[PDB]
């Protein structure tokens, strides 16, 4: 078999779960896992432009294999946890950024 | 100077596209092909 380049014909026997739109949910299209937010997309794919990539070879767009719709893969907000304190000798209340 | 930091940052991103000798350059689909008993061999190459 070949992997991750040609359109997937032979595929696994799992139920076709309904799509969740515009919020951080997991996705799995033709065996491609990931985490992000799916949105309706500009940048019209050519009839055979199935997949999508970026500089880091990370997925940014995908099409529904059952409905002729073009989506985008965008990972939602994240970041680090930072704490602002005046010192244990001062008080206990703190600020988190 | 502003471009040099941007050019170094952009070049760092490009290196994520290389598998470093592994079967794939993406960690997402490696775990879906190898069990954790043997997934340590392939992922360790990408870690280094």
């Amino acid at each position: 078999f070949e992997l991750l380049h040609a359109p997937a014909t032979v595929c696994g026997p799992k139920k076709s779960t309904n799509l969740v739109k515009n919020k951080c949910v997991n996705f799995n299209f033709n065996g491609l896992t990931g985490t992000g937010v799916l949105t309706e997309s500009n940048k019209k794919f050519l009839p055979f432009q199935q997949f999508g990539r970026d500089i880091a070879d990370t997925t940014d767009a995908v099409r529904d294999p059952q409905t002729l719709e073009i989506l985008d893969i965008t990972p939602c907000s994240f970041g680090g946890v930072s704490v602002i304190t005046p010192g244990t000798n001062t008080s206990n209340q703190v600020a988190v950024l | 100077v502003v471009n040099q930091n941007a050019q170094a940052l952009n070049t760092l991103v490009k290196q994520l596209s290389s598998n470093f000798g592994a079967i794939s350059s993406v960690l997402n689909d490696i775990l879906s092909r190898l069990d954790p008993p043997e997934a340590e061999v392939q992922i360790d190459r990408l870690i280094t």
């Binding site: - | 941007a6 940052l9 952009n10 991103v13």
Partner: peptide, 30 residues
């Protein structure tokens, strides 16, 4: 070169000229 009260900020007539010459999606991918 002194700040002018025309623009809302205290930016000067040369600072905005300097601010426009050098520049920093490409930023979204990072």
């Amino acid at each position: 070169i002194l700040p002018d009260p025309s623009k809302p900020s205290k930016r000067s007539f040369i600072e905005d000229l300097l601010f426009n010459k050098v520049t920093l999606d490409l930023i979204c991918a990072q």
